[PDB]
């Protein structure tokens, strides 16, 4: 088999469509997601044209090996897609309608800057390489782009599944390549992060601040050091669900900043004890009373500054 | 091969059945379960009809490639099922009896609202796409739907395996699709959660309340902060077996509420110490004595309210 | 190819044998184990009979596709076995000797009631479905059932590998099914549980009982709360190697009971402190002295009761 | 099929090229990385020469089985590459242009000495074994070596992808082998290690040094022992992301050294308490005051020495 | 195809060789390792003999399906090897030279008695089963046994790769089996265990002994209980990288023994406090002073005894 010949000098247009059946396993650390979808392909092959009136058949069904099929691939997949041809239909003028159901693990970079209040644009890049005989170009049949209503991505809200209709045509290894960008827009369900990580992290921090209403050094050391260790546990827990980033994430910024609050609280607790031992408690009292206001105020203002810089 | 021709204008009815052999690996985080079952298919193909007298055979056995077989797929599977054809039997009138044994990883959403006292309805969606020549519709042969008596799902009780007899017929990519819903009803074995998570979590909370019978601030700080850290460990342990949900789970609600009890216990312990240092112990004694009743009473009432809202 | 015809109305007997080469990966949580073995099959096919005198050959060698082979399957496997045919030998009377080497992941329920002093009977169920032309029945050739001397299952002792010689013949989807039960009896190597989990768990518990020889409330709170947290760590460690069970395991019973001992020790420590603060130390002394005897005595008797109920 | 015959006694030159499409999963512990790329091959086969006038076509397209293709393999791969032939083009003189897209898990040793400020040279070794009829030698077509602009390796910066143009020709099992070295130079994104591991580790260490401004032995024991335990947690966290090395890593050296600082701090805290109990506080005061300067000074100098030895 | 006929009554000798290309993933818990190697096979098949003068060729190249090839298998593999035939060469006298490149996951028991200062002998068992027509025996061609210089096993030192030249010939299911033992000798790189596990474990133990220079019960309880908990963490860490053994490992023996030292240290701390409360400090002082010498002395002697018993 060889590609369909051009009537004049035009490239062969392969109309494409992706219909999502299932979306699952969005792995933040690996920056991958699994997809199960229909891939539809359509092109004109005049060598396959037939007469509807004489044949009595309006459509002809072929096996993939019987006819020429464009070699369509995915750019950003771990391994080649697991595909099963559903149907191949040829109309009298030779218009081929190809349909396959596939499953693939897609590599798509994620921006963690606003985590866990982040939104992502996942990409599925469709590609075709031109042949010596003729140039193959990709197009989007909007009527064949979509998703099943039941499509759910655990821990995420699916906003839209659209295609950038204009392909990216470029030369690669002295041959033309036609690339299409299918975009799956998602937003993270931040809900569970509030009662499980954010509020427990704030509770232990506020518990360390009770040391500002205590003169007992031994109890203060226990309050600030124990809560700091619990904060380290939350820092470790958060970083297990995330890859290492060359930038600060919103959660990472708050987590880092809270260490400074624990460090300064230890200094205050040390300074307070030192002064009391030195028979200067009136002074230790001034620092402790100021700390009661300073710590929540600086914490509130620093969080307003951080939320502003990130959102 | 092509589909069987209609005698009049009727769709081809493909009778289906699923007989469960094995059920395993219900993954809560992934919202998947693995299945090993028999898939039975039945349809009339008049082109395969034969005479029992002249052939001397009552039934004819064929290889899948020798005859036309409907392209039956599963909607909610990770990858295409691993299938092996067991038997293909044709009766004299051309009634085909197809039997295959398959294994598949099924994606089926789970409702964690009542966890670990939750029940689920797992789904296996059977589907067929219509061809140009004729429309293919699915039906349930109740005589061929069931499960082996030994079918066990570790950590779950299997209630029933039934099929919604009426298919969901709809248009997808300008062709008719016929979808059947096979339902596996299961209920979680909550037993082990009681001695391993629920009671240890209650024990540490009740241990923190012993601080209401102590005037020792240093011992009280140790009691409430240490048990809080153990509560954080249980919260982390529980969330490792669960995906992130955009709603509160029953266990999650109790776990979250217990943090408030630890936070208020720290306030009480701080207030008690502060008053005693300020030479107001008679007052601290009133707050501590009230706390001895208030903490278990509010805990009991809040749990009754939560159990009511969730069950 | 079609099945061998019956001389009279008898079922076709397929003689079976399993020879274990390797046993590995017994997964307690998944209730699976991996196996690498020889599967031997033998049946009479008169259509394959030949003359030993005239041919000069005692045996004929065939390729699997050249002759009829019974469709033998495993009931309790995750996916279909990975099999490679080793030999097919036909004797002059038409007796076929089939040999394949296979590997499979077997699902076999485990009874954790006596863990880690438990024994298990792992099952490998062989099955054949009857055809329209004739009924197929399975048999055990004891001469072809066994295991390699070097067969080791890490963390387990292999006792025996035997087969229940009588098949379970039953009707499934209007056809006869012949099922054989191959049993691999194993006993857990409990050794390592003693120095790694049991004795460290007992050491920390006995350390909490030193609080009965101390009047220091602050030190007592530290002794009982710290060791309780270490007990929680051991409880979590034990449950990571086990699935969730709808029953109590022996280890689970001891682990649960030890929480009650920590809870009552906290009550004692609280009662002792309360009385001393109330200027009643003579009374606190009576409770503490009684606790020194009561705690080890009740612990010993409760363990005798538990060991009796479980063994 | 057999190899192309030599015109004289020359080896067959197979021109190669690797164009990276995707780079992912750099596993530090396993010392592997996954790659998705184009492999281009070119060689002259005069037996495939054709006349464009007689055949009509200027270039001929073949299926891999139809013609002789050199057996090109990767040396350092876990399993054989997952490859799909994209195109096989034959020009009139018999010049074959082969193009395949492949995915592979590559084993490439990593030097962790400067971790997490390390750089690596990942290797992809291309190899061909000579046949009896003639010797096969590999060459690099620099025009067909490259990488997609979007190629990203999560947690790493990609510097370059080049090939050592001269093959390593050697004898292996009495036949010639021609090996090419494709090099992917990467540098670790150390950024996240600073707020997540390095600074929290320094904070807890500096917190232990507050014991040098405290006379309270019981608070000092709490300060140094608690922070030491947090340091053990960070040591364990760091070693989970690394394989075991027969050398010290930069991070490993700092982590190890910090233990010595905790050990000497415990000695100081013990010595201080012992002297105070012995009614020698003036002396304990001299040791404690010296420690306030000695500990940060020795820590700074030891880190300058370590940074010098490692960088 | 059938096996080569014997000239007299001799068994067919199949000469073997294994050349290691890659060694990776030595899994201690699973007792497996992955291998990528060349498997060479050689045997005489007179039916393939040819004349060099008449044919004009000195060697003939065949496809595996064209000629008879002995069914060579690996005994101790999880699944069948992933193999690709590289070359099949036939010399004029009919001497066949077979070469394949394979990858396999090998099951090989490990002796952990001296861990982490252990050495292992990994085995790769080659096997052939005899046919009815004739007996097949295996031999080692030492010229074709070896390993690439770059072969590295992360965390291990590779000593040698040799073969036991004499096969183990035995009867299995009334047929002869010929088994060869290929041995890969390795020694563990214990280096990293010293700064990461051994020395931190010793530091925390020595820190618990500072309680013998302290009269403060509350600080002593904190010293011994906190370090014991850190020792439990190291015990858990060590056992995660090891399978459960029916024997004591060297590290396991030291780890277990250290618990006894913590237990006796708690008794000493309790006895010391009890006597001081009972107004007997002169006596408590004698026990504490003796403990300062006894604990390091008994620890040193017990370790000398253990090292002697294990090495
Ligand atoms: C008034 C004293 C202010 C002390 C400020 C401490 C600055 C620490 C800088 C860390 C930089 C990163 C290095 C940690 C040492 C902590 C010393 C605690 C202070 C001692 C109290 C003395 C009371 C007079
Ligand atoms: C300690 C700090 C606690 C966290 C504070 C909330 C972060 C925030 O402000 O989060 C903001 C995000 C919404 O982000 P967005 O609207 O989608 O960004 C797009 C906005 N632009 C386009 C204008 C830039 O979530 C929320 O509305 C937060 C609701 C939950 C609050 C939980 C409080 C505990
Ligand atoms: C009578 C005093 C009541 C204190 C109530 C504390 C409200 C905390 C609100 C947290 C909201 C989330 C922020 C945490 C600070 C804790 C202060 C502890 C009280 C000090 C005791 C003084 C005794 C007179
Ligand atoms: C702290 C709080 C402790 C947990 C309290 C039990 C939760 C509950 O009430 O759980 C209820 C579930 C049963 O739910 P169901 O009957 O199937 O729901 C369907 C009911 N409708 C249809 C009416 C809505 O389990 C039990 O019977 C609990 C038995 C174990 C108790 C363990 C106590 C510790
Ligand atoms: C003589 C007092 C006995 C106290 C028994 C405590 C029973 C706890 C029941 C838990 C049920 C599950 C709920 C936990 C509260 C602990 C209170 C500790 C006792 C206070 C000491 C007073 C000394 C006079
Ligand atoms: C705290 C409690 C500590 C655990 C006590 C041992 C449990 C037990 O008694 O275990 C019993 C099992 C043996 O069980 P079996 O003989 O195979 O059961 C079959 C018996 N029938 C058929 C009569 C029912 O192991 C042992 O012999 C235990 C040896 C190690 C002791 C470690 C002590 C620490
Ligand atoms: C002036 C006393 C210096 C003590 C130096 C301790 C050296 C420890 C060597 C560890 C080698 C690895 C072995 C740990 C014992 C710690 C003893 C603590 C000192 C007691 C204080 C006495 C004050 C007079
Ligand atoms: C406690 C010790 C804290 C760590 C100190 C930094 C290590 C270092 O000095 O790291 C050095 C590396 C750069 O290494 P390079 O230039 O690529 O090596 C090649 C150099 N040659 C060729 C000359 C040998 O990162 C940095 O510039 C460090 C920036 C972040 C500092 C974080 C401080 C906290
Ligand atoms: C002189 C007293 C020696 C005490 C020896 C303790 C032996 C413990 C045996 C455990 C066997 C496993 C069971 C743990 C109880 C610990 C008691 C601590 C001793 C009380 C001090 C009294 C000082 C007069
Ligand atoms: C607490 C105890 C600390 C561990 C003591 C070392 C164990 C040992 O003695 O290890 C011994 C092994 C060597 O064993 P081998 O020579 O290969 O055995 C074969 C010997 N035969 C054939 C004679 C039986 O490593 C070493 O040389 C140890 C070097 C590192 C010491 C780290 C100290 C911390
Ligand atoms: Cl693809
Ligand atoms: Cl499917
Ligand atoms: Cl099977
Ligand atoms: Cl390869
Ligand atoms: Cl094999
Ligand atoms: Cl024998
Ligand atoms: Cl034999
Ligand atoms: Na085609
Ligand atoms: Na068909
Ligand atoms: Na067959
Ligand atoms: Na070829
Ligand atoms: Na304390
Ligand atoms: Na062969």
Instruction: Classify each residue of B34-45 as buried b or exposed e, where b means 16 or more C-beta atoms within 10 Å of its C-beta.
Output: bbbbbbbbbbbb
For E10, half-sphere exposure in the C-beta direction (CA atoms, 13 angstrom radius) is 9
Of E154, E200, E222, the CB nearest to D31: E154
What is the 8-class DSSP label of residue D52?
Answer: H
Output the CA–CA distances (angstroms, integers) from residue B225 to A231, B219, D203, in the order listed. 13, 10, 21
Co-location of C122 and C212 in the same domain? no
User: Which one, of A28, A14, A21, A41, lies nearest residue A104 by Cα?
Assistant: A21
User: Which one, of C230, D243, C146, C283, lies nearest residue B233 by Cα?
Assistant: C230
For the packed helices B250-277 and B199-208, what is the interaxial angle rounded to 10 degrees?
10
* Count of other CB atoms within 10 angstroms of residue E252: 21
3-state secondary structure of B43: strand
Contact D102, D37 (CB under 8 A): yes
Tokens 């996240």 belong to residue: D192
Output the CA–CA distances (angstroms, integers) from residue B187 to B111, B151, C242, in the order listed. 12, 14, 20
* Count of other CB atoms within 10 angstroms of residue C206: 16
Output the CA–CA distances (angstroms, integers) from residue D47 to B261, D92, D133, E11, in the order listed. 86, 11, 15, 43
Which residues are bridge partners to E172 per DSSP? E175
Strands B32-44 and B95-107: antiparallel
Distance from C-alpha of D200 to C-alpha of D192, rounded to nearest angstrom: 12
Contact C212, C288 (CB under 8 A): yes
Distance from C-alpha of D73 to C-alpha of D75, rounded to nearest angstrom: 6
Instruction: Single out the residue in B192, B226, B259 at which a domain terminates.
Output: B192
Residue A99 tokens, joined: 């349909």
Q: What's the distance, CA B264 to chain centroid?
A: 37
Output the CA–CA distances (angstroms, integers) from residue D189 to A109, D147, D162, in the order listed. 16, 20, 21
CB within 8 Å of B49: residues ≥ 6 apart: B92, B93, B94
Contact E163, E181 (CB under 8 A): yes
Residue E311 tokens, joined: 């090495």
The finding on whether E194 has its CB within 6 A of some atom of ligand 10 is yes
Contact E121, E160 (CB under 8 A): no
Long-range contact list for A65-71, CB < 8 A, 24+ apart? A67/A1, A67/A96, A68/A1, A68/A2, A68/A3, A68/A4, A69/A41, A69/A98, A70/A3, A70/A12, A70/A14, A70/A41, A70/A43, A70/A128, A70/A136, A71/A128, A71/A129, A71/D86, A71/D87
Distance from C-alpha of C11 to C-alpha of C32, rounded to nearest angstrom: 34
CB contact under 8 A, E21 and D132: no
Distance from C-alpha of C204 to C-alpha of E201, rounded to nearest angstrom: 18
CB within 8 Å of B18: residues ≥ 6 apart: B37, B38, B39, B40, B124, B126, B145, B161, B163, B182
Residue A255 tokens, joined: 């987590």
Contact E206, E140 (CB under 8 A): no
Tokens 């003693």 belong to residue: C194
Co-location of A205 and A172 in the same domain? no
* Count of other CB atoms within 10 angstroms of residue B187: 13
Co-location of D48 and D177 in the same domain? yes
Is the minimum CB–CB distance between C82 and chain B shorter than 8 Å?
A: no
* Count of other CB atoms within 10 angstroms of residue E18: 22
Residue D239 tokens, joined: 């070693």
Residues B170/B171/B177/B179 CA torsion (nearest 10 deg) = -30
Of B61, B189, B234, the CB nearest to C132: B61
Contact E271, E240 (CB under 8 A): no
CB within 8 Å of E152: residues ≥ 6 apart: D109, E23, E158
E74 torsion bin: left (phi>0), alpha (psi -120 to 50), beta (else): beta
CB within 8 Å of A247: residues ≥ 6 apart: A112, A113, D191
| Neighboring chain E residues of D79 at a CB cutoff of 8 Å | 82, 103
SS (H, E, C) chain A: CCCCCCCCCCCEEEEEEEEEEEEEEEECCCCEEEEEEEEEEEEECHHHCCCHHHHCCCCEECCHHHCCCCCEEECCECCCCEEEEEEEEECCCCEEEEEEEEEEEEECCCCCCCCCCCEEEEEEEEEEECCCCCCEEEEECHHHCEECCCCCECCEEEEEEEEEEEEEEEEECCEEEEEEEEEEEEEECCCCHHHHHHHHHHHHHHHHHHHHHCCCHHHHHHHHHHHHHHHHHHHHHHHHCCCCCCCCCHHHHHHHHHHHHHHHHHHHHHHHHHHHHCCCHHHHHHHHHHHHHHHHHHHHHHHHHHHHHHC
Reported structure resolution in angstroms: 2.5
CATH number (domain holding residue D157): 2.70.170.10
Residue D207 tokens, joined: 């917190």
Residue nearest to atom 23 of ligand 3 (CA): B271
Residues A269/A272/A273/A277 CA torsion (nearest 10 deg) = 170
Strands E136-140 and E12-27: parallel
Q: What is the H or E stretch that residue C260 is in?
A: helix C250-277
Q: CB-based burial of residue D199 (10 Å sphere; 0-12 exposed, 13-18 middle, 19+ buried)?
A: middle
User: Which one, of A240, A146, A156, A150, lies nearest residue A197 by Cα?
Assistant: A240
CB within 8 Å of A49: residues ≥ 6 apart: A92, A93, A94
Is the minimum CB–CB distance between A2 and chain D shorter than 8 Å?
A: yes
Output the CA–CA distances (angstroms, integers) from residue A11 to A132, D99, D122, in the order listed. 12, 22, 40
Distance from C-alpha of C228 to C-alpha of C222, rounded to nearest angstrom: 10
Residue nearest to atom 11 of ligand 3 (CA): A206
User: Which one, of B118, B239, B109, lies nearest residue A193 by Cα?
Assistant: B239
Nearest atom within ligand 9 for CA of residue C206: 14
Q: CB-based burial of residue D201 (10 Å sphere; 0-12 exposed, 13-18 middle, 19+ buried)?
A: buried
* Count of other CB atoms within 10 angstroms of residue D1: 11
Contact D178, D136 (CB under 8 A): yes
Q: How was this entry determined?
A: X-ray
Distance from C-alpha of E273 to C-alpha of E281, rounded to nearest angstrom: 9
Q: Which of residues 94-153 of A touch B (CB under 8 A)?
A: 99, 101, 103, 144, 148, 152
User: Which one, of D230, D211, D28, lies nearest residue D115 by Cα?
Assistant: D28
Instruction: Classify each residue of E122-160 as buried b or exposed e, where b means 16 or more C-beta atoms within 10 Å of its C-beta.
Output: bbbbbbbbbbbbbbbbbbbeeebbbbbeebbbbbbebee
CB contact under 8 A, C228 and B193: no
Please report which residue ranges of chain E form alpha helices under DSSP H: 52-55, 193, 199-208, 217-240, 250-277, 281-310
Co-location of E257 and E135 in the same domain? no
For B86, half-sphere exposure in the C-beta direction (CA atoms, 13 angstrom radius) is 25
Q: What's the distance, CA D236 to chain centroid?
A: 21
E-strand ranges in chain B read 12-27, 32-44, 60-61, 72-74, 82-90, 95-107, 119-129, 136-140, 146-147, 156-172, 175-188
Q: CB-based burial of residue C279 (10 Å sphere; 0-12 exposed, 13-18 middle, 19+ buried)?
A: exposed
Q: CB-based burial of residue B104 (10 Å sphere; 0-12 exposed, 13-18 middle, 19+ buried)?
A: buried
CB contact under 8 A, D24 and A107: yes
User: Which one, of D116, D110, D124, D121, lies nearest residue D244 by Cα?
Assistant: D110
For D184, half-sphere exposure in the C-beta direction (CA atoms, 13 angstrom radius) is 30
Q: What's the distance, CA D51 to chain centroid?
A: 50
Instruction: Single out the residue in D170, D192, D214 at which a domain terminates.
Output: D192
Is the minimum CB–CB distance between C19 and chain E shorter than 8 Å?
A: yes
Residues D148/D152/D153/D154 CA torsion (nearest 10 deg) = -160
Instruction: Single out the residue in A175, A192, A209 at which a domain terminates.
Output: A192
Question: Measured on CA atoms in the order C229, C230, C236, C239, is the torsion positive or negative?
Answer: negative
Residue C150 sits at φ, ψ, to 5 deg, of -80, -5
Is the minimum CB–CB distance between C84 and chain E shorter than 8 Å?
A: yes
User: Which one, of D85, D6, D18, D31, lies nearest residue D241 by Cα?
Assistant: D31
Q: What is the H or E stretch that residue C52 is in?
A: helix C52-55
Q: What is the H or E stretch that residue C53 is in?
A: helix C52-55
Q: How many residues does chain C have?
A: 311
C-alpha E98 – ligand 22 centre gap (Å): 72
User: Which one, of A43, A239, A261, A265, lies nearest residue A136 by Cα?
Assistant: A43
Output the CA–CA distances (angstroms, integers) from residue A18 to A15, A71, B77, D24, in the order listed. 11, 16, 18, 25
Q: CB-based burial of residue C63 (10 Å sphere; 0-12 exposed, 13-18 middle, 19+ buried)?
A: exposed
Contact B112, B242 (CB under 8 A): yes
Which residues are bridge partners to A187 per DSSP? A119, A157
Residue A289 sits at φ, ψ, to 5 deg, of -65, -40
How does DSSP assign E196-226, residue by residue? IIIHHHHHHHHHHGGGGG---HHHHHHHHHH
Is the minimum CB–CB distance between B7 and chain A shorter than 8 Å?
A: no
Co-location of C186 and C266 in the same domain? no
Co-location of E135 and E84 in the same domain? yes
CB contact under 8 A, C2 and B207: no
Distance from C-alpha of D276 to C-alpha of D287, rounded to nearest angstrom: 12
Q: Cis link prior to E116 (omega < 30° from 0)?
A: yes
Residue D128 tokens, joined: 């061909």
CB contact under 8 A, A277 and D59: no
Q: How many residues does chain E have?
A: 311
| Neighboring chain B residues of C222 at a CB cutoff of 8 Å | 222
What is the 8-class DSSP label of residue D59?
Answer: S
Tokens 């020194």 belong to residue: C292
Residue E142 tokens, joined: 């030492």
Output the CA–CA distances (angstroms, integers) from residue E225 to A227, C227, D272, in the order listed. 19, 8, 22
Co-location of B152 and B222 in the same domain? no
A90 torsion bin: left (phi>0), alpha (psi -120 to 50), beta (else): beta
Please report which residue ranges of B118-249 form alpha helices under DSSP H: 193, 199-208, 217-240
Distance from C-alpha of B174 to C-alpha of D131, rounded to nearest angstrom: 55
| Distance linking the first and last C-alpha atoms of chain D | 56
Output the CA–CA distances (angstroms, integers) from residue D304 to D112, D116, E99, in the order listed. 20, 17, 56
Residue E94 tokens, joined: 């009919």
Q: How many residues does chain D have?
A: 311
Co-location of B164 and B259 in the same domain? no
Co-location of E212 and E176 in the same domain? no
Q: CB-based burial of residue C51 (10 Å sphere; 0-12 exposed, 13-18 middle, 19+ buried)?
A: exposed
What is the 8-class DSSP label of residue C153?
Answer: B
Residue A225 tokens, joined: 């050091």
User: Which one, of E97, E94, E2, lies nearest residue E49 by Cα?
Assistant: E94
Q: Which domain range does residue D274 map to?
A: 193-311
| Neighboring chain C residues of E255 at a CB cutoff of 8 Å | 195
Q: CB-based burial of residue A64 (10 Å sphere; 0-12 exposed, 13-18 middle, 19+ buried)?
A: exposed
Q: What is the H or E stretch that residue E51 is in?
A: none
Co-location of D198 and D183 in the same domain? no
Contact D310, E249 (CB under 8 A): no
How does DSSP assign D177-234, residue by residue? EEEEEEEEEEEE--TTHIIIIIHHHHHHHHHHGGGGG---HHHHHHHHHHHHHHHHHH
Residues D212/D215/D218/D222 CA torsion (nearest 10 deg) = -20
Is the minimum CB–CB distance between A185 and chain D shorter than 8 Å?
A: no
Name which of D227, D265, D267, D270 to mutate to probe chain E: the one with the most chain E Cβ atoms within 10 A of its Cβ.
Answer: D270
Co-location of D49 and D101 in the same domain? yes
| Neighboring chain B residues of C109 at a CB cutoff of 8 Å | 152, 154
Tokens 């009634």 belong to residue: B95
Residue B81 sits at φ, ψ, to 5 deg, of -55, 145
CATH number (domain holding residue A240): 1.20.58.390
Residue nearest to atom 18 of ligand 6 (CA): C311
Lateral strand order in the sheet of C72-74: C72-74, C119-129, C176-188, C156-171
Tokens 């017929």 belong to residue: B169
What is the 8-class DSSP label of residue C198?
Answer: I
User: Which one, of B140, B106, B99, B142, lies nearest residue B122 by Cα?
Assistant: B106
Ligand 7 pocket test: pick from E210, E268, E300 the residue with the most ligand atoms within 8 Å of its Cβ: E210
Look at chain A and report how many structural domains it folds into: 2
Q: How many residues does chain A have?
A: 311
Is the minimum CB–CB distance between B217 and chain A shorter than 8 Å?
A: yes
Strands E72-74 and E175-188: unpaired
B125 torsion bin: left (phi>0), alpha (psi -120 to 50), beta (else): beta
Co-location of A128 and A199 in the same domain? no
Please report which residue ranges of chain D form alpha helices under DSSP H: 52-55, 193, 199-208, 217-240, 250-277, 281-310
């Amino acid at each position: 088999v060889s590609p369909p010949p051009p009537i004049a000098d035009e490239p062969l247009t392969v109309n494409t469509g992706i219909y999502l059946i299932e979306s699952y396993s969005l792995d933040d650390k690996a920056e991958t997601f699994k997809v199960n979808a229909f891939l539809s392909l359509s092109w004109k092959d005049r060598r396959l044209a037939f007469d509807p009136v004489r044949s009595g058949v309006r459509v002809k069904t072929y096996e993939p090996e019987a006819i020429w099929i464009p070699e369509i691939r995915f750019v950003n997949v771990e391994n080649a897609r697991d595909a099963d041809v559903v149907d191949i239909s040829v109309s009298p003028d030779g218009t081929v309608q190809y349909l396959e159901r596939f499953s693939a693990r897609v590599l798509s970079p994620l921006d963690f800057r606003r985590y866990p209040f982040d939104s992502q644009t996942l990409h599925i890049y469709l590609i075709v390489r031109s042949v010596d005989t003729r140039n193959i170009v990709l197009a989007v049949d909007l009527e064949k782009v979509g998703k099943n209503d039941d499509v759910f991505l655990t821990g995420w809200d699916i906003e839209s599944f659209t295609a950038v209709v204009k392909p990216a045509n470029f030369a690669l290894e002295d041959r033309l390549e036609s690339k299409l960008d299918y975009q799956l827009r998602i937003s993270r369900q931040y809900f569970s992060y509030i009662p499980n990580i954010i509020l427990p992290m704030l509770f232990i921090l506020f518990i360390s601040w009770t040391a500002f209403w205590s003169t007992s050094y031994e109890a203060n050391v226990t309050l600030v050091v124990s809560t700091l260790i619990a904060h380290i546990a939350f820092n470790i827990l958060v970083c297990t669900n995330l890859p290492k980033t060359p930038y600060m994430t919103y959660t990472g910024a708050i987590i880092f900043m809270i260490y400074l609050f624990y460090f300064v609280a230890v200094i205050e607790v040390t300074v307070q004890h030192y002064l009391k031992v030195e028979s200067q408690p009136a002074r230790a009292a001034s620092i402790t009373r100021a700390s009661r206001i300073a710590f929540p105020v600086v914490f509130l203002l620093a969080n307003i500054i951080l939320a502003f810089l990130f959102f």
